[PDB]
Amino acid sequence: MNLSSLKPAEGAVKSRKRIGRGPGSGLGGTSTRGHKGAKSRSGYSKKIGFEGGQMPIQRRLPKFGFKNINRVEYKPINLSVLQTLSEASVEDLIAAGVSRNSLVKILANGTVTTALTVEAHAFSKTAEEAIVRAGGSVVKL
Amino acid sequence: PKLKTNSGAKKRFALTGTGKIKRKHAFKSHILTKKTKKQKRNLTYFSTVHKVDENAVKQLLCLR
Amino acid sequence: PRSVNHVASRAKRKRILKLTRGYFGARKNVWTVAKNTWEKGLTYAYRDRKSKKRNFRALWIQRINAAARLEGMSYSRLMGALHANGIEINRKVLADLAMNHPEAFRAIVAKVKN
Amino acid sequence: RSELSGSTRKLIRQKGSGGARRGDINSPLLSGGARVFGPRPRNYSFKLNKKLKALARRSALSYKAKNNEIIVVEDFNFDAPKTKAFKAISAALKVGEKKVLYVLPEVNKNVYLSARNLPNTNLILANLINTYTVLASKNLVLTERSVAVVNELFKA
RNA sequence: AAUGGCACAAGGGUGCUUGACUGGGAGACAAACAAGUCGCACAGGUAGGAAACUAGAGCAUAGUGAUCCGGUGGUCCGC
RNA sequence: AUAUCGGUAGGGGAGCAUUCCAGCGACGUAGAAGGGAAAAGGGCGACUUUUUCUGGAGUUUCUGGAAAAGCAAA
RNA sequence: UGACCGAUGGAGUGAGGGCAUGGGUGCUAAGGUCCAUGUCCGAGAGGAGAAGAAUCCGGACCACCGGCUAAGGUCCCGAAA
RNA sequence: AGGGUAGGGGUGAAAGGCUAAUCAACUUGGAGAUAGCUCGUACUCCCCGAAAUGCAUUUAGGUGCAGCCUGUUGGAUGU
RNA sequence: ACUGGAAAGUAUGGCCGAAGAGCAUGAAAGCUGCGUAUCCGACAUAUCCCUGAGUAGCGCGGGACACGAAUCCUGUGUGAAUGGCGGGGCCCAUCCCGUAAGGCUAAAUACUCCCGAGAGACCGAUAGUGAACCAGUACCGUGAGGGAAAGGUGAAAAGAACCUCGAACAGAGGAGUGCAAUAGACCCUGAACCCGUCUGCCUACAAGCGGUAGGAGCGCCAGGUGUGACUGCGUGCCUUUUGCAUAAUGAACCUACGAGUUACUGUUUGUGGCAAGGUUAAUUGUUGACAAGGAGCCGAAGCGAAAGCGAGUCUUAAAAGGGCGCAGUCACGAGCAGUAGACGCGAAACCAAGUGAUCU
RNA sequence: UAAGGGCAGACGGUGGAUGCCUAGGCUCUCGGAGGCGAAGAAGGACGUGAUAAGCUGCGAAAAGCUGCGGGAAUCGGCACAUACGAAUUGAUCCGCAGAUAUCCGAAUGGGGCAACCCGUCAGGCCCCUGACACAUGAAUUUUCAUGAGCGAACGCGGGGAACUGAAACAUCUCAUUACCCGUAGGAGAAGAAAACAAGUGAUUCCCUCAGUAGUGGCGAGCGAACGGGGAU
């Protein structure tokens, strides 16, 4: 093609909807609005959370809980991912192949079966047991 | 401008892993005694938002 | 950019005004009166295309009745005899023969007048 | 309506005049009134992914190469700006009949001045190649160093 | 109150008692939503009884009404 | 192949015309646009072609793009 | 038959009415009023009843100067004894 | 003839009279106030096609959610 | 050379190009004019030991801070210290940070009455500024104030000597100019509503939305066209309604004008690019384009109010006894939503600053 | 018989649609500049031409006067004009610098119904004239500089609504908005820790953090900062 025979992909573009332009279009007259009432007027909007005067659900259910402003959240890395990284080094925590300046926690999802030297901020008990069974090392910092 | 979150909704609702909305149970009568000890149904277990009432809590929490 | 379709807008009216020729008074040339008259005529034309078949069948039946009563029979008796003898000549052909080919109509009548 | 120059005074009283009820003079129903939903100043820029744009550039270059409208000439310099010299080069390369795009590796002030006045010719650096500029011209003339620059910069 | 039930009584007496329990809800009824109704299994330890068994209040259906903000008794987070 | 195809509110699909833009093709004082008359055409339609008179200088096809993008009643 | 059910995008409606049946109310009145079960008008053209929203027959893709029927009809206006 | 009292302010031998043909003032601006109300809403062809009920409501000619329509889908059962 | 009133048009054939931007010229010009690329040019005139007292702090009443009672401010009443004092969200202690009651300070930021150079998938005379022209004019009002309509002969005025009718150019018919005067001053083009003349056919026994379907005769230019005796059927349209010929609403008619738009943020979907990853924002370089910018955002683990544990977790003394869990991302187009006047016209009113006692 | 009427065609009238055209608007970009005025402003009045001036220009020296530089044949402004003159001894025109510049207006000698009336003192002419001076407030020492008024937006400061939303309404919102008033500069304001925080290191602005922390008849709503990346 060139600039004189441009073509988009089939179904990529579509004409917009135009209302109030006659009977043949199927969208004239009342222009998809119905007949009367509040919803047919210019400038109508929905009051969000308004149910006609009944007590709304966000007011009749109770508030619960509190959030911790000093919350430590780790990033879950599993043993199967650790194996995948190990298969094309031994000393792990390279993190350049994945997080970006965060705390990491090793969890037990697959298996290791290979001697690693995994270093991470925190570990699971099953993770440490699996590393020991595979004949590896755990460094926690 | 960006859509604003409803403050009461953000204090009353939470999201789960599958995208379901969980909530606390309001009592029928909040004066315990003269109500059967089976009030653990509304006193111990978090429930979910009914599918019919859904999309309203979503719009309250900015369709999240 | 600013788009106004002056020529197309006027041509649409002029085409319909060409069809409203011959009407009475304002109905021939005054746009909102002429357009109103034209569409009612179109509904009339739709109904009249249906009623034309009824009218022409009634005319054929009346002419056949006259010719058969000349021959000494009524329309209903002649049609009963024709259907019993199983000939498939339709009312338009029978009326055309009755008005223009009386010898052929006489032949048809004599075949079934047994 | 809010930026017309007429006053906001009600033109006629609400009831009793016998005509249509009227507000202020800036109404769109009145001759010389407001322009409803007219144009507003706009920014028409939109975003395409970098990989999408690179793929489009490669697609345009491949279209040219497949349709056999790419020819490679030696690098040349002009001692003085000479439109006749550039025209002679174009006629020798047989790209004077239609639109042609030259791809150069460097500035080449004299060459640019020589090519400035010719109708169906365009000049562009190799590192500034874009899909529209490639597709706009019938023929594409690369130089020896332009081939190397395009190969090293727009590869993969 | 009315309706339905009730003799192996769910009606009336004595004796002993605290199950007017803790942790609970396979499964259903009903229902715009909010609310509502019946009911586990098993474990801990009891009451009655020779045992079997029964007891998570009352023959059943009315006897209240959210959220927010406050009070009281127990038991994780703030600077 | 069979079946189906009345429709208000309303949902869905496919298109015509208008103004400007890019690319590619064209037309015009041997007569452009506009105005009058006539003729033909379209699964169907919005509309499109052709001839002639007036007119006396601009217009148009195809593909894609963008909207001050269509009136009978307030 | 085919559209029943799930999940999702978009709605409109939330003034109904007539007839038949079972009832309440009224006066065993109302083209009255309030419910239930069907149906039609609403949103439905065509035929008969002189002329009638919902009574009887019947659901209109377009064309035809072809044929058969439904309700109801066949002395003339007006098709057919 | 000249002067003074200015907006619910003045003035009123009191009628809520008069205050520039305006009185339970005028001009400009906030301002395109608000109007759950009335009216109006423009090219074409094709396919499908309702509701006028329930619950709640300072609600009753408004609205929320169900019920009934439509588009795309995945299961299958609906009559 | 051709056409033309007139070539810049067409067709040949040449030439310049650091100049093929443009405007004008009797039609559309690289080579006719002014210009353009490029180079050159200014007599002046401008511009470049000491250490902040009615202080810190405090009581009462208020205010600003995102905050509707920690920090900062103060109307009222009080009132120190010289390592001390202040702050880290009520209050105390430890710790950490800082050094009030004195002052000045460029850059990166906001805006356009004005001057200069440019641009537009902006308008083209009911549009675009109210104002293309005599425009804040005419007109209206005591006043503050409100506030229009109105562009186009022709290339060139060559803007019609003279004649005829007529009292007169009032107007016209000629002559003449001109490509054209049916371009003649209101002058390009010259539509509709509305108003006439001529020609053809019909019409004075006939009765309802004015058409529609049949159908003689007459009349024109070879199968088309005008009219139409006579026959059948037919209570306009919009809106609003359970239901409208309705005696419910609405319009004198024509031409022109007139009402779901745009921005941002979500969400769903059609089509695409990458893919366990996806994508840059502000901004920065080289010349709108290429290249750089990884800050940030989503995804990649969940459960629990939380500490926390983790393909588990919560409840429990303990139990699956119960609850919740065991391919994305970035765009382009389209639907919908919210926030902005948000489909258009329409109140009665409320508030602020002014103008009026020339009437009464 | 058509008095009249109906339909069609042709040709006219009226009217000014449409098409084509236009420097008159609209929105911006880049670079400058960001004031004028008591040495009298903005804005006006009255004049000024060979022929009345409606605009334009100018000011009793009045479509104009002088010098220097540029330049070379027409010129004497425009609303469809003739006359009469100027000009190669260099007009007209363009750039820079000068001269003149009536009256009102902050208006400033005193008044006043703006564009007018009435004065005093020093001189000069000659009851009347032309030319001087004669205001007020603040630094100031009666000598001196400065100020007053006007004017686009942007800045800072002093006062400060209501309609509206919350489906009523009073806390709340609209909004420290509209509006009134005062006062700068080319920008203004801010700015060098009795700071944030749980190591950074003065202000200002942009992108994020984030519709998050908070706040709120915990309703409608409102809504940061730390940190990170930049401009400087």
Ligand SMILES: [K+]
């Ligand atoms: K008992």
Ligand SMILES: [K+]
């Ligand atoms: K009858």
Ligand SMILES: [K+]
């Ligand atoms: K008959």
Ligand SMILES: [K+]
């Ligand atoms: K030229």
Ligand SMILES: [K+]
């Ligand atoms: K002409």
Ligand SMILES: [K+]
């Ligand atoms: K012309």
Ligand SMILES: [K+]
């Ligand atoms: K005419």
Ligand SMILES: [K+]
């Ligand atoms: K007729």
Ligand SMILES: [K+]
């Ligand atoms: K009426």
Ligand SMILES: [K+]
């Ligand atoms: K008086």
Ligand SMILES: [K+]
């Ligand atoms: K400063």
Ligand SMILES: [Mg+2]
């Ligand atoms: Mg519809």
Ligand SMILES: [Mg+2]
């Ligand atoms: Mg309509």
Ligand SMILES: [Mg+2]
């Ligand atoms: Mg309506």
Ligand SMILES: [Mg+2]
């Ligand atoms: Mg209604």
Ligand SMILES: [Mg+2]
């Ligand atoms: Mg509605």
